[PDB]
Design a protein around this ligand. Structure first.
Ligand SMILES: O=S(=O)(O)OC[C@H]1O[C@@](COS(=O)(=O)O)(O[C@H]2O[C@H](COS(=O)(=O)O)[C@@H](OS(=O)(=O)O)[C@H](OS(=O)(=O)O)[C@H]2OS(=O)(=O)O)[C@@H](OS(=O)(=O)O)[C@@H]1OS(=O)(=O)O
Length: 131
């Protein structure tokens, strides 16, 4: 929540989180892709935004539970950051917090849906690395 740009790596299937020019969100194993470089920033304590440096779009979660890219920052773009016991990070949707809907990636690299996520899954665990 912080100063240099980062990558976000998910060890479930070995993919980095990725934000595309058309507004779609997925994951990839190709460490050279320019759409995987991210800039995090802190609202207040334990709350963050996540932006793609190349396109300029913000990460968001919609009413059905899927991830997508937004040109303007809004309430659907805010997330709750947690440093877990095993020392990974998790991100929870603010607007849908009463249901425990997480950001996550499937074994095949496409995005998980909010309603299909739980505490304990490999899919929800992320690790920040330097670009
Ligand atoms: O066809 S299976 O019965 O093998 O199910 C595999 C799919 O289930 C997930 C979770 O999907 S969900 O129901 O929408 O939440 O993974 C779950 O099952 C796999 C298989 O292992 S098992 O011993 O046969 O149950 C487990 O992965 S692993 O430990 O074998 O590496 C998952 O455990 S883990 O969280 O990755 O450690 C297990 O998750 S859970 O405890 O039931 O929540 C899907 O994986 S997912 O993409 O991470 O959501 C599997 O979908 S798949 O693309 O067909 O592989």
């Amino acid at each position: 929540n912080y100063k240099k740009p980062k990558l976000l790596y998910c060890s479930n299937g070995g993919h980095f989180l990725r934000i595309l020019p058309d507004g779609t969100v997925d994951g990839t194993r190709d460490r050279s892709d320019q759409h995987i470089q991210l800039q995090l920033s802190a609202e207040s304590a334990g709350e963050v935004y996540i932006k793609g440096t190349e396109t300029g779009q913000y990460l968001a979660m919609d009413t059905e539970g899927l991830l997508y890219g937004s040109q303007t920052p809004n309430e659907e773009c805010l997330f709750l950051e947690r440093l877990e016991e095993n020392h990974y990070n998790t991100y929870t949707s603010k607007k849908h917090a009463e249901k425990n809907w997480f950001v996550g990636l499937k074994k095949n690299g496409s995005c998980k849906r909010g309603p299909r996520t739980h505490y304990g899954q490999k899919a929800i665990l992320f690790l920040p690395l330097p670009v």
